[PDB]
Design a binder for these strands. Structure first.
Ligand SMILES: [Mg+2]
Ligand SMILES: [Mg+2]
Ligand SMILES: [Mg+2]
Ligand SMILES: [Mg+2]
Ligand SMILES: [Mg+2]
Ligand SMILES: [Mg+2]
Ligand SMILES: [Mg+2]
Ligand SMILES: [Mg+2]
Ligand SMILES: [Mg+2]
Ligand SMILES: [Mg+2]
Ligand SMILES: [Mg+2]
Ligand SMILES: [Mg+2]
Ligand SMILES: [Mg+2]
Ligand SMILES: [Mg+2]
Ligand SMILES: [Mg+2]
Ligand SMILES: [Mg+2]
Ligand SMILES: [Mg+2]
Ligand SMILES: [Mg+2]
Ligand SMILES: [Mg+2]
Ligand SMILES: [Mg+2]
Ligand SMILES: [Mg+2]
Ligand SMILES: [Mg+2]
Ligand SMILES: [Mg+2]
Ligand SMILES: [Mg+2]
Ligand SMILES: [Mg+2]
Ligand SMILES: [Mg+2]
Ligand SMILES: [Mg+2]
Ligand SMILES: [Mg+2]
Ligand SMILES: [Mg+2]
Ligand SMILES: [Mg+2]
Ligand SMILES: [Mg+2]
Ligand SMILES: [Mg+2]
Ligand SMILES: [Mg+2]
Ligand SMILES: [Mg+2]
Ligand SMILES: [Mg+2]
Ligand SMILES: [Mg+2]
Ligand SMILES: [Mg+2]
Ligand SMILES: [Mg+2]
Ligand SMILES: [Mg+2]
Ligand SMILES: [Mg+2]
Ligand SMILES: [Mg+2]
Ligand SMILES: [Mg+2]
Ligand SMILES: [Mg+2]
Ligand SMILES: [Mg+2]
Ligand SMILES: [Mg+2]
Ligand SMILES: [Mg+2]
Ligand SMILES: [Mg+2]
Ligand SMILES: [Mg+2]
Ligand SMILES: [Mg+2]
Ligand SMILES: [Mg+2]
Ligand SMILES: [Mg+2]
Ligand SMILES: [Mg+2]
Ligand SMILES: [Mg+2]
Ligand SMILES: [Mg+2]
Ligand SMILES: [Mg+2]
Ligand SMILES: [Mg+2]
Ligand SMILES: [Mg+2]
Ligand SMILES: [Mg+2]
Ligand SMILES: [Mg+2]
Ligand SMILES: [Mg+2]
Ligand SMILES: [Mg+2]
Ligand SMILES: [Mg+2]
Ligand SMILES: [Mg+2]
Ligand SMILES: [Mg+2]
Ligand SMILES: [Mg+2]
Ligand SMILES: [Mg+2]
Ligand SMILES: [Mg+2]
Ligand SMILES: [Mg+2]
Ligand SMILES: [Mg+2]
Ligand SMILES: [Mg+2]
Ligand SMILES: [Mg+2]
Ligand SMILES: [Mg+2]
Ligand SMILES: [Mg+2]
Ligand SMILES: [Mg+2]
Ligand SMILES: [Mg+2]
Ligand SMILES: [Mg+2]
Ligand SMILES: [Mg+2]
Ligand SMILES: [Mg+2]
Ligand SMILES: [Mg+2]
Ligand SMILES: [Mg+2]
Ligand SMILES: [Mg+2]
Ligand SMILES: [Mg+2]
Ligand SMILES: [Mg+2]
Ligand SMILES: [Mg+2]
Ligand SMILES: [Mg+2]
Ligand SMILES: [Mg+2]
Ligand SMILES: [Mg+2]
Ligand SMILES: [Mg+2]
Ligand SMILES: [Mg+2]
Ligand SMILES: [Mg+2]
Ligand SMILES: [Mg+2]
Ligand SMILES: [Mg+2]
Ligand SMILES: [Mg+2]
Ligand SMILES: [Mg+2]
Ligand SMILES: [Mg+2]
Ligand SMILES: [Mg+2]
Ligand SMILES: [Mg+2]
Ligand SMILES: [Mg+2]
Ligand SMILES: [Mg+2]
Ligand SMILES: [Mg+2]
Ligand SMILES: [Mg+2]
Ligand SMILES: [Mg+2]
Ligand SMILES: [Mg+2]
Ligand SMILES: [Mg+2]
Ligand SMILES: [Mg+2]
Ligand SMILES: [Mg+2]
Ligand SMILES: [Mg+2]
Ligand SMILES: [Mg+2]
Ligand SMILES: [Mg+2]
Ligand SMILES: [Mg+2]
Ligand SMILES: [Mg+2]
Ligand SMILES: [Mg+2]
Ligand SMILES: [Mg+2]
Ligand SMILES: [Mg+2]
Ligand SMILES: [Mg+2]
Ligand SMILES: [Mg+2]
Ligand SMILES: [Mg+2]
Ligand SMILES: [Mg+2]
Ligand SMILES: [Mg+2]
Ligand SMILES: [Mg+2]
Ligand SMILES: [Mg+2]
Ligand SMILES: [Mg+2]
Ligand SMILES: [Mg+2]
Ligand SMILES: [Mg+2]
Ligand SMILES: [Mg+2]
Ligand SMILES: [Mg+2]
Ligand SMILES: [Mg+2]
Ligand SMILES: [Mg+2]
Ligand SMILES: [Mg+2]
Ligand SMILES: [Mg+2]
Ligand SMILES: [Mg+2]
Ligand SMILES: [Mg+2]
Ligand SMILES: [Mg+2]
Ligand SMILES: [Mg+2]
Ligand SMILES: [Mg+2]
Ligand SMILES: [Mg+2]
Ligand SMILES: [Mg+2]
Ligand SMILES: [Mg+2]
Ligand SMILES: [Mg+2]
Ligand SMILES: [Mg+2]
Ligand SMILES: [Mg+2]
Ligand SMILES: [Mg+2]
Ligand SMILES: [Mg+2]
Ligand SMILES: [Mg+2]
Ligand SMILES: [Mg+2]
Ligand SMILES: [Mg+2]
Ligand SMILES: [Mg+2]
Ligand SMILES: [Mg+2]
Ligand SMILES: [Mg+2]
Ligand SMILES: [Mg+2]
Ligand SMILES: [Mg+2]
Ligand SMILES: [Mg+2]
Ligand SMILES: [Mg+2]
Ligand SMILES: [Mg+2]
Ligand SMILES: [Mg+2]
Ligand SMILES: [Mg+2]
Ligand SMILES: [Mg+2]
Ligand SMILES: [Mg+2]
Ligand SMILES: [Mg+2]
Ligand SMILES: [Mg+2]
Ligand SMILES: [Mg+2]
Ligand SMILES: [Mg+2]
Ligand SMILES: [Mg+2]
Ligand SMILES: [Mg+2]
Ligand SMILES: [Mg+2]
Ligand SMILES: [Mg+2]
Ligand SMILES: [Mg+2]
Ligand SMILES: [Mg+2]
Ligand SMILES: [Mg+2]
Ligand SMILES: [Mg+2]
Ligand SMILES: [Mg+2]
Ligand SMILES: [Mg+2]
Ligand SMILES: [Mg+2]
Ligand SMILES: [Mg+2]
Ligand SMILES: [Mg+2]
Ligand SMILES: [Mg+2]
Ligand SMILES: [Mg+2]
Ligand SMILES: [Mg+2]
Ligand SMILES: [Mg+2]
Ligand SMILES: [Mg+2]
Ligand SMILES: [Mg+2]
Ligand SMILES: [Mg+2]
Ligand SMILES: [Mg+2]
Lengths: 97, 147
RNA sequence: GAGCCGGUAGCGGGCGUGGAUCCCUGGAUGUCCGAAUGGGGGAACCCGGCCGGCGGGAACGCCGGUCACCGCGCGCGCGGGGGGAACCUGGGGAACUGAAACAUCUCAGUACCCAGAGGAGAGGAAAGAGAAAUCGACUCCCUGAGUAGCGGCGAGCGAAAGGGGACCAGCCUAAACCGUCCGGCUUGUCCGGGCGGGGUCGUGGGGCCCUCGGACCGAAUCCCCAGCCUAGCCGAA
RNA sequence: GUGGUUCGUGGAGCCAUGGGGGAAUCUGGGCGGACCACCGCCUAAGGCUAAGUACUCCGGGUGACCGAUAGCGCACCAGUA
RNA sequence: CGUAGGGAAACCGAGUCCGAACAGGGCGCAGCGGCCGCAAAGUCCGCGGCCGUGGACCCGAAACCGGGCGAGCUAGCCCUGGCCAGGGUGAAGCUGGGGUGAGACCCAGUGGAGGCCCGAACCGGUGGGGGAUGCAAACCCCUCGGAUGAGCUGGGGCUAGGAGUGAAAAGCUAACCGAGCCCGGAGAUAGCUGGUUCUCCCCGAAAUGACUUUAGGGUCAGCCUCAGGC
RNA sequence: GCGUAGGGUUAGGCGGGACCUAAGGUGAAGCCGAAAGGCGUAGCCGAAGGGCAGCCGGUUAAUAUUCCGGCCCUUCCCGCA
RNA sequence: CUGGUGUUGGCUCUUGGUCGCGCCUGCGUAGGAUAGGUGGGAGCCUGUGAACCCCCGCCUCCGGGUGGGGGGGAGGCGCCGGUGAAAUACCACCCUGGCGCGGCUGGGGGCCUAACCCUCGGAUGGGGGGACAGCGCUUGGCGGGCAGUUUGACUGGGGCGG
RNA sequence: GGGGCCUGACUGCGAGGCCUGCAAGCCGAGCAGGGGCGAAAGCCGGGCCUAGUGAACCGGUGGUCCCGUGUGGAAGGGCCA
């Protein structure tokens, strides 16, 4: 229920459509809409605790790009990173995206 | 997920082998505990490479030795010593053998590698294994004679 | 170019050809509040740290300078914060009403809220349009047309191509390949991250590899100028 | 599962994407209204880009616009009493 | 826009559609004088009446919705303080005596409990009369309830619009609360009521029928009117 | 208690600050939300609670525990013991 | 509330389907005898030691089959013809069903731990829960808790009746 | 009322009219196609008659082979019942 830190995904808005009756293709009169109401669709966000530079880094990223986190990590090896703090190692990774 | 292993894991895969397992198992267990690596591209070349060197050096030695052998195999180590008849007074050791091959034939060696538990004490004609590289032995005939 | 000290006369005193008042551009000063930012705060109030000065000055007080938070970049530098009548784009987003009731539908993604930008904003150089065997980025107006189609085919909704006009313009990167600086351990023909070169297209193009051949284009950034703006002046009888 | 387009599931493609599965580099791939083939158009998943366009707090010109119950709520010390 | 129409369409075309048809039927097809002039289909701009779309003749709702403002009145709670004259009854407990095997328990003194009692301040508002363009958009007088409790009260706070509080009356939430107020969508909608401004001249109605979630509103016909034609 | 003009409010000790904490308010760290914003130990803000050293009298047309008088007290800076 | 899937992993047991192999198994007149099908097909067997005797399982349509183990240890079945629709030694490819290893999955049981969640003056860690729960896309249901509306006209006033 | 052979309980149209606000509902000679009863003239487009019914929208089934969204097909439609 927020924003992927890797994909920039974000809660979009979708309608909840309610339909009744038989379709045409099933040899029926056709579908009928009985009630449309906005919903909202969330990205399947999850936590991703990783340890980098002897420091724990956790992302609130959607389940889609989870394998990108480790990529960032894997890609971050070539960086002066010791001595830094968590928020510092995060920002340094994100800059790789 | 295809992964690269860092330590052989029972009934799973040999060190350096590449297997395909459940992503949950790979990233919540094998990668944390330094037990394996993503079969990526980046740190997939680094595996394709160290096999070369490790195959290059071994292939190097197993040739820097065959190069040796041919040096030996076509010659004989003669050792003069003081003795009456077939039993020697002193003794001829590998370190002794070393001096010779160093002395004559301008070759250097490691006595420890040479196979010869008991220091020779009687004369005759001997063939002894040097064992410079396993699976790659040598047969060096040494003529120990007196005077 | 002869009067002036605002609307405003008077009391009381001045100034102006040694060119004032007045008008236009630049500069200085500019208490206190306000994004307000040293700290607090019931805005314009209250209380501090540091460096330097004043007073007879140590306590007390005044004066000048500096001290909030955030992002980015190798404690110090550039930037942000807020305001603006509507106009613009993005994130959200109703209802009365219409359907002569009403739920799909309409009103309408309009009103409104929020973030952002700017003198404009958006869009924009085809993974387009769509039947011409053709067109050639995008934007706007006309027209195409209330056509095609959409619709409890009810009320109602409503295009695009093409054509005629305004304007006119096209570019930089990413990846392969060459080189270089750094750091990681699992020692290289390695992987990773910076920078530079190279490259950017659809008759497909580009790299590397041979082979043949070796000046004309030109900016949207910079500079000089005319032109224009912000006070004015001459002006027949 | 939705949103946009004239398209209200309709035969429903095209553009966009919240969820799942998940490739390729020109012998590639998206498109031409479900789908298949032929024939054609284009070349996504990085970005920038003047003018022609919109508004009017501001200044100016002009009206078969008003003329103090009109014209802006205010012609005057008005967003005031 | 017009010059060609017919058909659901391919498609034919002064014809075409249903059809086997040369049949029958539907919708269609053709200026005036003496080349000239004149008239005209059509089309274009003006003017006029009327219709469609927009607030569409003017004013008026009760209500719906969106974003903001309000708990300085009132309701509940939180934090901190304050107030309750005087008099009356006289619980447990204690002391002692009687009492018994020890007790329970009975009496006298002490003692001072209680959403206890009477009565001011404070808080309330039972009944009556006055008041009624009032002193007052809830007041005055007499009587009356509670009055150490679930009490009253100052000050600083928090909770709000389909939401808050509510010892519960749908009461209260800034003097009208069955969903507050302001501003906006907005000129909402109103088939209802009202209102519609100079003069003269000619004609001159209807209040019926049919259908109508229609019956005090509308569509067609009927009755009125105007221009042209017969 | 209205119109015009002039005059009048004097604190180291009375009240509030440079002292403190309450409900509550805000709010390093940290958490949450399409934006706006909503939470949140510490810390800060927050009073009619806590803490802190002035009592009597005289004076003016108008102020005084504020000026005057007498008698007391607080805190801070420097210096001596 | 709920099934499927993402977050979401490890090991073993017991069952279900699949492909891979060892395999084995199929019963009418007729016909040596218990014929799975289409072949290939007139020779295949033994020191990879034969007719025939005995010992264990296997299926048993009660007749046999097969695997076997010992003795002996060198013979036996094909075409020929009996025979039937189809016919036999032998060599493949497929079925019937059934058995064990391997695959790959679906259920159920049990246990881990590392994701995830709670907790611990100590926090790259300890401890409990535990791949369930929470959460995301999705299916279906319950659902006046709230939301938008409908609840007809004629009528000797409306309603009831008609 | 009885019985014989029969399917006109037709297809393609249909002059002219009743009724009439619209839309509907009603009668209908005759022409061709192909048939039935009759010797023939002739009758027959269901029933002596007047009620036995329901407009459009949406969709089902058979047929037609009209359109087919670059082209040939298909999806989906239109016409007939
Ligand atoms: Mg849904
Ligand atoms: Mg169909
Ligand atoms: Mg529908
Ligand atoms: Mg995770
Ligand atoms: Mg995935
Ligand atoms: Mg990327
Ligand atoms: Mg003056
Ligand atoms: Mg004077
Ligand atoms: Mg000053
Ligand atoms: Mg400040
Ligand atoms: Mg502040
Ligand atoms: Mg100083
Ligand atoms: Mg001073
Ligand atoms: Mg200062
Ligand atoms: Mg701004
Ligand atoms: Mg928008
Ligand atoms: Mg809403
Ligand atoms: Mg509505
Ligand atoms: Mg309206
Ligand atoms: Mg209407
Ligand atoms: Mg409307
Ligand atoms: Mg309506
Ligand atoms: Mg209506
Ligand atoms: Mg209604
Ligand atoms: Mg709309
Ligand atoms: Mg918007
Ligand atoms: Mg802002
Ligand atoms: Mg702004
Ligand atoms: Mg411009
Ligand atoms: Mg731009
Ligand atoms: Mg391009
Ligand atoms: Mg047109
Ligand atoms: Mg038109
Ligand atoms: Mg219709
Ligand atoms: Mg619309
Ligand atoms: Mg165009
Ligand atoms: Mg054009
Ligand atoms: Mg122009
Ligand atoms: Mg051009
Ligand atoms: Mg490099
Ligand atoms: Mg090429
Ligand atoms: Mg440029
Ligand atoms: Mg002049
Ligand atoms: Mg839609
Ligand atoms: Mg459908
Ligand atoms: Mg759709
Ligand atoms: Mg289109
Ligand atoms: Mg998606
Ligand atoms: Mg191709
Ligand atoms: Mg391809
Ligand atoms: Mg595509
Ligand atoms: Mg596609
Ligand atoms: Mg396609
Ligand atoms: Mg296309
Ligand atoms: Mg197509
Ligand atoms: Mg092709
Ligand atoms: Mg194209
Ligand atoms: Mg591309
Ligand atoms: Mg852009
Ligand atoms: Mg621009
Ligand atoms: Mg422009
Ligand atoms: Mg102007
Ligand atoms: Mg005038
Ligand atoms: Mg005038
Ligand atoms: Mg006036
Ligand atoms: Mg006025
Ligand atoms: Mg006047
Ligand atoms: Mg005709
Ligand atoms: Mg005719
Ligand atoms: Mg004419
Ligand atoms: Mg006209
Ligand atoms: Mg009209
Ligand atoms: Mg309107
Ligand atoms: Mg009007
Ligand atoms: Mg009005
Ligand atoms: Mg109104
Ligand atoms: Mg309502
Ligand atoms: Mg409501
Ligand atoms: Mg209160
Ligand atoms: Mg109060
Ligand atoms: Mg109460
Ligand atoms: Mg208290
Ligand atoms: Mg108290
Ligand atoms: Mg009392
Ligand atoms: Mg008492
Ligand atoms: Mg006691
Ligand atoms: Mg006693
Ligand atoms: Mg008492
Ligand atoms: Mg009492
Ligand atoms: Mg009492
Ligand atoms: Mg009361
Ligand atoms: Mg009373
Ligand atoms: Mg009362
Ligand atoms: Mg009374
Ligand atoms: Mg009386
Ligand atoms: Mg009374
Ligand atoms: Mg009375
Ligand atoms: Mg009143
Ligand atoms: Mg009253
Ligand atoms: Mg009284
Ligand atoms: Mg009393
Ligand atoms: Mg009383
Ligand atoms: Mg009481
Ligand atoms: Mg009492
Ligand atoms: Mg109390
Ligand atoms: Mg109180
Ligand atoms: Mg209070
Ligand atoms: Mg208060
Ligand atoms: Mg509140
Ligand atoms: Mg409300
Ligand atoms: Mg509201
Ligand atoms: Mg609100
Ligand atoms: Mg409520
Ligand atoms: Mg109010
Ligand atoms: Mg009220
Ligand atoms: Mg209401
Ligand atoms: Mg009120
Ligand atoms: Mg507003
Ligand atoms: Mg409106
Ligand atoms: Mg209404
Ligand atoms: Mg008059
Ligand atoms: Mg009538
Ligand atoms: Mg009708
Ligand atoms: Mg009806
Ligand atoms: Mg009536
Ligand atoms: Mg009429
Ligand atoms: Mg006439
Ligand atoms: Mg007085
Ligand atoms: Mg006075
Ligand atoms: Mg006077
Ligand atoms: Mg005086
Ligand atoms: Mg004093
Ligand atoms: Mg003080
Ligand atoms: Mg101080
Ligand atoms: Mg404090
Ligand atoms: Mg807060
Ligand atoms: Mg707090
Ligand atoms: Mg402090
Ligand atoms: Mg205090
Ligand atoms: Mg105090
Ligand atoms: Mg004190
Ligand atoms: Mg004090
Ligand atoms: Mg004292
Ligand atoms: Mg005084
Ligand atoms: Mg001392
Ligand atoms: Mg799952
Ligand atoms: Mg367990
Ligand atoms: Mg789960
Ligand atoms: Mg979560
Ligand atoms: Mg559902
Ligand atoms: Mg209810
Ligand atoms: Mg219900
Ligand atoms: Mg409700
Ligand atoms: Mg309701
Ligand atoms: Mg409504
Ligand atoms: Mg009625
Ligand atoms: Mg009737
Ligand atoms: Mg009646
Ligand atoms: Mg009556
Ligand atoms: Mg009546
Ligand atoms: Mg009647
Ligand atoms: Mg009834
Ligand atoms: Mg008969
Ligand atoms: Mg008969
Ligand atoms: Mg016959
Ligand atoms: Mg007729
Ligand atoms: Mg008629
Ligand atoms: Mg009928
Ligand atoms: Mg005939
Ligand atoms: Mg005949
Ligand atoms: Mg006959
Ligand atoms: Mg007839
Ligand atoms: Mg009948
Ligand atoms: Mg009969
Ligand atoms: Mg009926
Ligand atoms: Mg309908
Ligand atoms: Mg036809
Ligand atoms: Mg086609
Ligand atoms: Mg065709
Ligand atoms: Mg073909
Ligand atoms: Mg076909
Ligand atoms: Mg079809
Ligand atoms: Mg069809």
């Amino acid at each position: 229920s927020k924003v992927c830190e890797i994909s920039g995904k974000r809660p979009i808005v979708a309608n909840s459509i309610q339909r009744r009756g038989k379709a045409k293709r099933e040899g029926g009169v056709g579908k009928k809409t009985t009630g449309i109401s906005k919903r909202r669709q969330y990205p399947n966000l999850q936590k991703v605790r990783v340890r980098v530079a002897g420091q724990e880094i956790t992302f609130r990223v959607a389940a889609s790009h989870i394998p990108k986190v480790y990529e960032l990590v894997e890609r971050a090896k070539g960086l002066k990173l010791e001595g830094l703090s968590p928020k510092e190692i995060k920002k340094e990774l994100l800059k790789l995206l | 997920m295809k992964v690269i292993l860092l330590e052989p894991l029972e009934n799973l895969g040999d060190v350096g082998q590449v297997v395909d397992v459940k992503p949950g198992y790979a990233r919540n267990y094998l990668l944390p505990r330094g037990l394996a690596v993503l079969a990526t591209e980046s740190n997939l070349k680094a595996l394709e490479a160290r096999i070369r060197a490790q195959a290059k050096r071994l292939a190097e030695r197993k040739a820097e030795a065959e190069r040796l052998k041919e040096i030996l195999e076509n010659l004989t180590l003669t050792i003069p010593v003081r003795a009456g008849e077939t039993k020697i007074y002193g003794s001829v050791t590998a370190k002794d053998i070393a001096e010779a091959l160093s002395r004559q034939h301008g070759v250097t060696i490691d006595p420890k590698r040479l196979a010869l538990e008991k220091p020779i004490k009687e004369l005759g004609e001997y063939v002894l294994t040097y064992k410079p590289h396993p699976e790659v032995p040598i047969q060096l005939k040494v003529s120990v004679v007196a005077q």
